[PDB]
Design a protein around this ligand. Structure first.
Ligand SMILES: *[C@@H]1O[C@H](CO)[C@@H](O[C@@H]2O[C@H](CO)[C@@H](O[C@@H]3O[C@H](CO[C@H]4O[C@H](CO)[C@@H](O)[C@H](O)[C@@H]4O)[C@@H](O)[C@H](O[C@H]4O[C@H](CO)[C@@H](O)[C@H](O)[C@@H]4O)[C@@H]3O)[C@H](O)[C@H]2NC(C)=O)[C@H](O)[C@H]1NC(C)=O
Ligand SMILES: *[C@@H]1O[C@H](CO)[C@@H](O[C@@H]2O[C@H](CO)[C@@H](O[C@@H]3O[C@H](CO[C@H]4O[C@H](CO)[C@@H](O)[C@H](O)[C@@H]4O)[C@@H](O)[C@H](O[C@H]4O[C@H](CO)[C@@H](O)[C@H](O)[C@@H]4O)[C@@H]3O)[C@H](O)[C@H]2NC(C)=O)[C@H](O)[C@H]1NC(C)=O
Ligand SMILES: *[C@@H]1O[C@H](CO)[C@@H](O[C@@H]2O[C@H](CO)[C@@H](O[C@@H]3O[C@H](CO[C@H]4O[C@H](CO)[C@@H](O)[C@H](O)[C@@H]4O)[C@@H](O)[C@H](O[C@H]4O[C@H](CO)[C@@H](O)[C@H](O)[C@@H]4O)[C@@H]3O)[C@H](O)[C@H]2NC(C)=O)[C@H](O)[C@H]1NC(C)=O
Ligand SMILES: *[C@@H]1O[C@H](CO)[C@@H](O[C@@H]2O[C@H](CO)[C@@H](O[C@@H]3O[C@H](CO)[C@@H](O)[C@H](O)[C@@H]3O)[C@H](O)[C@H]2NC(C)=O)[C@H](O)[C@H]1NC(C)=O
Ligand SMILES: *[C@@H]1O[C@H](CO)[C@@H](O[C@@H]2O[C@H](CO)[C@@H](O[C@@H]3O[C@H](CO)[C@@H](O)[C@H](O)[C@@H]3O)[C@H](O)[C@H]2NC(C)=O)[C@H](O)[C@H]1NC(C)=O
Ligand SMILES: *[C@@H]1O[C@H](CO)[C@@H](O[C@@H]2O[C@H](CO)[C@@H](O[C@@H]3O[C@H](CO)[C@@H](O)[C@H](O)[C@@H]3O)[C@H](O)[C@H]2NC(C)=O)[C@H](O)[C@H]1NC(C)=O
Ligand SMILES: *[C@@H]1O[C@H](CO[C@@H]2O[C@@H](C)[C@@H](O)[C@@H](O)[C@@H]2O)[C@@H](O[C@@H]2O[C@H](CO)[C@@H](O)[C@H](O)[C@H]2NC(C)=O)[C@H](O)[C@H]1NC(C)=O
Ligand SMILES: *[C@@H]1O[C@H](CO[C@@H]2O[C@@H](C)[C@@H](O)[C@@H](O)[C@@H]2O)[C@@H](O[C@@H]2O[C@H](CO)[C@@H](O)[C@H](O)[C@H]2NC(C)=O)[C@H](O)[C@H]1NC(C)=O
Ligand SMILES: *[C@@H]1O[C@H](CO[C@@H]2O[C@@H](C)[C@@H](O)[C@@H](O)[C@@H]2O)[C@@H](O[C@@H]2O[C@H](CO)[C@@H](O)[C@H](O)[C@H]2NC(C)=O)[C@H](O)[C@H]1NC(C)=O
Ligand SMILES: *[C@@H]1O[C@H](CO)[C@@H](O[C@@H]2O[C@H](CO)[C@@H](O)[C@H](O)[C@H]2NC(C)=O)[C@H](O)[C@H]1NC(C)=O
Ligand SMILES: *[C@@H]1O[C@H](CO)[C@@H](O[C@@H]2O[C@H](CO)[C@@H](O)[C@H](O)[C@H]2NC(C)=O)[C@H](O)[C@H]1NC(C)=O
Ligand SMILES: *[C@@H]1O[C@H](CO)[C@@H](O[C@@H]2O[C@H](CO)[C@@H](O)[C@H](O)[C@H]2NC(C)=O)[C@H](O)[C@H]1NC(C)=O
Ligand SMILES: *[C@@H]1O[C@H](CO)[C@@H](O[C@@H]2O[C@H](CO)[C@@H](O)[C@H](O)[C@H]2NC(C)=O)[C@H](O)[C@H]1NC(C)=O
Ligand SMILES: *[C@@H]1O[C@H](CO)[C@@H](O[C@@H]2O[C@H](CO)[C@@H](O)[C@H](O)[C@H]2NC(C)=O)[C@H](O)[C@H]1NC(C)=O
Lengths: 173, 323, 173, 323, 173, 323
């Protein structure tokens, strides 16, 4: 279930970003961006942690398994013992490899879903401004400082404060 | 001014196999499989293991005189055999139910070796020191086992033999004995002077009447006779009775047992050191917490679980896409 | 694969809704809403029913398993029997727990996908009217009775009937 | 006017464990694991089970005189032993191949107990009523088994014994016998007056020649002798022959068998009632349709499957998010 | 995880399309469409191929399994052998059936995700033109030949070339 | 002008079962389970299998004279028994450890049958041609086995018998013999003229002293006597010694062995042809590459894996929705 975000419409990754997994890059009048989003990455860390711990928990630990001995008139019992051991070994190696493959699929799809959800969350609160272009970028018809940037990073935007000026600018373009 | 949204990139190189693609490069991952082991055999939980050296289990219990150095061992965690251990039964024969005895020894943690029948007192009718074979040689001289006792006549006479022993130690007692039979009737009469003979062993749940068999057969270690060996567990209470005519290899030392499970007869020849672990293989020791293991399937302790793969890297993070 | 609908942009659930799993809430001139959608919930009920029945079907029922007896010279066979029983018990408990966990993941994602699909289905037939706001709500530029409500609930809207009046209203705003 | 879209909420409290989160609260769910059982042992499919009471299986088949109350039982579903069942072999000895006989009994559904050798007619040479031990006592008096027969001499004479029996019942016949051996040669001559003796049993696929063994041994239940027990299945056709000198414990009752599998030797002591189920454990009975089970691993019937977990709640519905 | 494309907003399939799995249908002044998209179908073919090969690879091949023989005093060993064989057979048939069911679910969701991603990829490069209608169809305010068709099929559109004429047409409508 | 986006449709009818829905119609799919097999038994990897025909394994090794046609067979891939194979031991008795011998034969790929004891030279004391039973009849006449040899007296005399054989072939040698015992003492004295008798076999790790048992028993195939059969593997080196009084069925042919595993005793009666496969069942042969198999669970070769299902169609493609 490729959600289309990672290596999709968003082209590549960020080396300069250090702190979290998912963040922003603001480019107003002063300074540049590369600020993480510590709210959506914490849920991801908790989910992956509880995933790995559960995978460790569902497996057990074997106790003392020591080989037995048979003479030359108990061949049937020896072949039966060898069959039992080989069977259980094959069953467990199959379970382990299959579990690892499916878990890797689901965790990559999980990160993809997180990025798409964060993009939709930004677009939902920026209603008709900012004219989204290219690899997940906006434009901001109205001009605003670092305060509106931090506002968008919080999840509160108070859209009727910046409505009419952005409307006039969108119309005059 | 823009609020471009993006994800994290890194310069890691660790790859992860998934279903739809191989060799995917992931930013962060975690290992789940063990490879490393120190090639040593340390002591499991403080108690040192008992190394037999050039000795078999049968050779150790019968008291083969090559296996003298481990004469005073009474505590272990697990028993080590090497690939050079060949000194089992010195006199040729067959140790009957040798594998069941190993399975009983895989649950016992200590011994108390003691005299059942004292050599100088319990036998005032027969000779007790003039009967010894040369197949079990020791430094040129001829010595027998260290836990059994050969019986010969005392001057052309052999009285009927009967001797019993009660149990008053609370623990189980492991008793061994033997029955000898020569290849010729002349040797039978020369050692025993009884054309017919028997031994008989009875306690409460063990009862057998052994008779010798005399037949010519090709020699092993320069001896044409044979000898069979036997073992019995007693209980706290019940007594054992031996009753013999001319064929008894009398017991001379017993073993009081002690429980406490999870032992083994690991066969390897990696050297023994004195560290402390919780998991032991024939290849070495393991120190970890990962749920899967790849060193060896035969383990003693609380060991991680054995599979037959080479890579179980599990991805915890994003696809590393450098722009 | 979190689709972002349940506890996402749609905030909470409805206690007052009784009949189905997925429905609407209409707020025209007369009355209030809380009407279920009996078309999209029936497919969900059939899917979950055929899921549970399949999970019951793939397991079998054990017949008479009675313990055996051994004397004091058959210790090897007894240990072999105990090993076989413990091995099979561990394999089946692993299979059961793992199946339950993965099935729970997939059914929650299934409900999430259903809600997002229903939202997209409404938005697709309301082309440029109604100015979608907040937690999956519309506005209806043109004024219409319970008949247009029931029309939207059916899946037919006849958009050119209400086009020009809504266009005039959208322009005069 | 708005057409706000939303999902269903509820006030349920049942939680469901998933991978990425624990204790998720779901609106509707379904259980898949059983816990409840009535602490009773009902009759599986109408036929009542046979409770041995204070009786062992060997004690029931040999006809131990303490086990008199179940003298006329010939139909069951499964055999119940209790934790107090100790009246097996009253006279001390060894029941040879006792476990194989239990595995044969785990497939038989009914009996027909009948006379092979009638006590008053088949033995007009020996004494048949003057030989009885006191270890198997019953209300002060001394009684032997109820299915076997001791044989003594008739006035300082013991003719050679031979007796055969053919099979004409279409079903398989389970035949038991015994071989007695005393501790002393004096007791041997006092009971039998034969220094050497044998018995011999032959049919077509069973053939053995038993000889007694005489040895002193410590007494159990105040008896120094021993007795061994044996059993053989016949077929429709082939005949059995007993041929004895001085050592026979002659059979006196047989058992015609009937097939019909899926029986057991469940050991528990929960009481017996007369309901009807399709699944039976030593702890109790089970009535359900869920695919997993948690009560006990040893089951008789068409039972749900045993795992070792405590919760298998499966979510069928939405995440309960109250607004 | 039904993504809503296959048998969703896109109603049915195309019989006339021959070459690939996912394609277009262009309806300009000359000719008709039914041209495949050989870039997005190749990744699908490679994914499904590496899926099937992996499923074949994880299973093994059994060697010589020949039945043993026992006499009429070794009933316990015979029942133990029968129990071991029946247990392993049940475990493997369970694994096989369960693997097939889950793999079928995931591959159908994979095709659904591919179709939705291709639709989003077209819509992302056609910014404000073409007024998307119905079952994944566009309109092209500006009139263009087979060259703009082949341009859209490549993934390059040069939107500022056709901006002002389409803007004038959208306004005059 | 429009750029309508759509997916592929087809007119296929193959359905695929998934979790949430049954019978889904998919455009392209792939099979993973085998059903077809040619009802023939071809030769695995060039070497033809050995068909016993109306012969048992015991009948083939002892050299039952009905089983004459396969007198010169010394190479196989796997051994075929039919449902009509009943000519095992012609003279009635018991083949001791018959199943262990089959498990040893399941690892041997060829033979070299040779004379141990030549019939005309090795026995210049006894009669070697005047002792033969009529139960093992052949075309009216009375013939014995083709690999063993009966021993009778030579004119009211029976010297003590002793004969040995060393091993000088590098390979393991499989040696068979027998011990006869009559039903009556009169028959014992009429054939052997020894009230007591024994045989004794000894090498290094095999040693037994057999004594006859004489008892009346009902006859099988019109013979009241019995005969027991025995087998022993030697090694490169060690020698075997037979030492007999009046009871020996002397060996007359041995078998040198050759390793090379993965053989079997497949029991079927489908006909034998001369194609070449890599997988063989009792129902037929298999030629495929799919990972699952449904024909039969008992296989020889490198066969696909057995499950117990009827359909494993796996979907590789879209949902076929015709518009
Ligand atoms: C514990 O086990 C060890 C081995 O792990 C035993 O020591 C071995 O004892 C065996 C048996 O005595 C030895 O093998 C034999 O050695 C005999 C004499 O030794 C010399 O000659 C041989 C070969 O001729 C050389 O290999 C060796 O180096 C010596 O120079 C040989 O005579 C034997 O060969 C043959 O002759 C005899 C007599 O005719 C025949 O019975 C045999 O069948 C054979 O044809 C044989 O080679 C072995 O060499 C010893 N090994 C070691 C390491 O010294 C211990 O004795 C045993 N412990 C106890 C309790 O005894
Ligand atoms: C079915 O199995 C039941 C038990 O489930 C048997 O009944 C038991 O029989 C045993 C053996 O007879 C009893 O144990 C012995 O009891 C003897 C006499 O009884 C009195 O004395 C003892 C202790 O001195 C008391 O416990 C008991 O209450 C009585 O007051 C004792 O003499 C035995 O002890 C010792 O002495 C003898 C003789 O010197 C020695 O052989 C022993 O080794 C030991 O040193 C012993 O305690 C047991 O008590 C009985 N139990 C019950 C419930 O009554 C049935 O008899 C058996 N059924 C058949 C067919 O017999
Ligand atoms: C290899 O195995 C085959 C079978 O696979 C053997 O051939 C069979 O040999 C048995 C034993 O000899 C035969 O069964 C018996 O046949 C006897 C005589 O044959 C005639 O009579 C019977 C019935 O009266 C007919 O079925 C048959 O067609 C003949 O007309 C019978 O006398 C036997 O019956 C009874 O009488 C005897 C004597 O009183 C009793 O011992 C028996 O208990 C029984 O009451 C019995 O029916 C069998 O028929 C043969 N089958 C075939 C196919 O011919 C081979 O002989 C054996 N190979 C070797 C090495 O011998
Ligand atoms: C989420 O985001 C908003 C948006 O930035 C945060 O609100 C801002 O918080 C600062 C903190 O001081 C406020 O500054 C205040 O300024 C006045 C003078 O104007 C001064 O008297 C106060 O002492 C304080 O310094 C700022 O006004 C406020 N937002 C604006 C610009 O209106 C908010 O903190 C973030 N967290 C929350 C609560 O969601
Ligand atoms: C799906 O939704 C539509 C929209 O409501 C349903 O159509 C409506 O059905 C009613 C049923 O009576 C129609 O009423 C009719 O009114 C006339 C008088 O105007 C009368 O002569 C008829 O006897 C009937 O009462 C109504 O007109 C019609 N829709 C409108 C308002 O145009 C429809 O039934 C739903 N189901 C279907 C078929 O999709
Ligand atoms: C992806 O799509 C574009 C859009 O069609 C392809 O570009 C077109 O390629 C043709 C190939 O000849 C160009 O034609 C050229 O015409 C001039 C005369 O105008 C002639 O001198 C050249 O020899 C050639 O025939 C065409 O101009 C060009 N696109 C346009 C219309 O600007 C492109 O090839 C596709 N592949 C790539 C590289 O992405
Ligand atoms: C997947 O990779 C492994 C290892 O190769 C590494 O990872 C690759 C993605 C690439 O970065 C390589 O440069 C890295 O070395 C491959 O396994 C090895 O493949 C090579 C041939 O390239 C072969 O010579 C080695 O013997 C292989 N080693 C082992 C132990 O398998 C593997 O082939 C790659 N699988 C693919 C690409 O399908
Ligand atoms: C998950 O919950 C169980 C049970 O707790 C219930 O559900 C919780 C979500 C919450 O609603 C509790 O109030 C409910 O009682 C927890 O298991 C128990 O945890 C408590 C500590 O809270 C402990 O004292 C009990 O012994 C535990 N019982 C058992 C049998 O495990 C469990 O810890 C929770 N897991 C989490 C939150 O990680
Ligand atoms: C699923 O289909 C099978 C086979 O039926 C075929 O596929 C169906 C979708 C439809 O196209 C049928 O016309 C095809 O024949 C069904 O299995 C058979 O069902 C019929 C009753 O319809 C029954 O008589 C047969 O005995 C069944 N055969 C076997 C071997 O099962 C199956 O019932 C369908 N499952 C559903 C629809 O739930
Ligand atoms: C890729 O870049 C990372 C950045 O973390 C490197 O990690 C650090 O590299 C510096 C170089 O001076 C070391 O001093 C640090 O110790 C490394 N880790 C830290 C921050 O402690 C990383 O080494 C680079 N790639 C490789 C090949 O590992
Ligand atoms: C939560 O609300 C539900 C509403 O169904 C309660 O269910 C009903 O509660 C009423 C209270 O009078 C009972 O009479 C009904 O029997 C209940 N079910 C019905 C409708 O038959 C539910 O009990 C409440 N919560 C709890 C604690 O269960
Ligand atoms: C076993 O369980 C069933 C229910 O699973 C019990 O039968 C129910 O009894 C009640 C009260 O008579 C009825 O209302 C239900 O209709 C019954 N259910 C069914 C399916 O029969 C039953 O009593 C329990 N005991 C037995 C032996 O059946
Ligand atoms: C459904 O249509 C397909 C189109 O490929 C049919 O396949 C071809 O049908 C023609 C009819 O003349 C045959 O000549 C071809 O051999 C078929 N395959 C090709 C192209 O080689 C298909 O047969 C039709 N449906 C069925 C019932 O299979
Ligand atoms: C076994 O199956 C293969 C096919 O899997 C058969 O070999 C094919 O024979 C046909 C006709 O000669 C050829 O067109 C194919 O190229 C062959 N395929 C392969 C892969 O060889 C074969 O005949 C069957 N029998 C044996 C014993 O191979």
């Amino acid at each position: 279930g490729l959600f289309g975000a990672i290596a999709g419409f968003i082209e590549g990754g960020w080396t300069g970003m250090i702190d979290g997994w998912y963040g922003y890059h603001h480019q107003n009048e002063q300074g540049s961006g590369y600020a993480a989003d510590q709210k959506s990455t914490q849920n991801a860390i908790d989910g992956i942690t509880s995933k790995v711990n559960s995978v460790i928990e569902k497996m057990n630990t074997q106790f003392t398994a020591v080989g037995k001995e048979f003479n030359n008139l108990e061949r049937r019992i020896e072949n039966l013992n060898k069959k039992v051991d080989d069977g259980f070994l094959d069953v467990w190696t199959y379970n382990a490899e299959l579990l690892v493959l499916l878990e890797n699929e689901r965790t990559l799809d999980f990160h993809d879903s997180n990025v798409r959800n964060l993009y939709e969350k930004v677009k939902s609160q920026l209603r008709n401004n900012a004219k989204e272009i290219g690899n997940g970028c906006f434009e901001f018809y109205h001009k605003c400082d670092d305060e509106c940037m931090e506002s968008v990073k919080n999840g509160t935007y108070d859209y009727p404060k910046y409505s009419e000026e952005s409307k006039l600018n969108r119309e005059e373009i | 001014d823009t609020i471009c949204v993006g994800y994290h990139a890194n310069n890691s190189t660790d790859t992860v196999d998934t279903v739809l693609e191989k060799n995917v490069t992931v930013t962060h991952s975690v290992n789940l499989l063990e490879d490393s082991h120190n090639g040593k055999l340390c002591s499991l939980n403080g108690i040192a293991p008992l190394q037999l050296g050039k000795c078999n289990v049968a050779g150790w219990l019968l008291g083969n005189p090559e296996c003298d150095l481990l004469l005073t061992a009474n505590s272990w965690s697990y028993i080590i055999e090497t690939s050079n251990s060949e000194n089992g039964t010195c006199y040729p024969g067959e140790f009957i139910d040798y594998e069941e005895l190993r399975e009983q020894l895989s649950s016992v943690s200590s011994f108390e070796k003691f005299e059942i029948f004292p050599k100088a007192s319990s036998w005032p009718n027969h000779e007790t020191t003039k009967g010894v074979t040369a197949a079990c040689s020791y430094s040129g001289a001829s010595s027998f086992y260290r836990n059994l006792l050969w019986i010969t006549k005392k001057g052309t006479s052999y009285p009927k033999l009967s001797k019993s022993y009660t149990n008053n130690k609370g623990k189980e007692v492991l008793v061994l004995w033997g029955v000898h039979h020569p290849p010729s009737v002349s040797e039978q009469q020369s050692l025993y002077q009884n054309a017919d003979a028997y031994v008989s062993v009875g306690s409460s749940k063990y009862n057998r009447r052994f008779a010798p068999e005399i037949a010519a057969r090709p020699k092993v270690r320069g001896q044409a006779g044979r000898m069979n060996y036997y073992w019995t567990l007693l209980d706290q209470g019940d007594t054992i009775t031996f009753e013999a005519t001319g064929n008894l290899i009398a017991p001379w030392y017993a073993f009081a047992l002690n429980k406490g499970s999870d032992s083994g007869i690991i066969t390897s020849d990696a050297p023994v050191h004195n560290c402390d672990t919780r998991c032991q293989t024939p290849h070495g020791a393991l120190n970890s917490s990962l749920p899967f293991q790849n060193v060896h399937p035969i383990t003693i302790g609380e060991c991680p679980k054995y599979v037959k793969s080479t890579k179980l890297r599990m991805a915890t993070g994003l696809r590393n896409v450098p722009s």
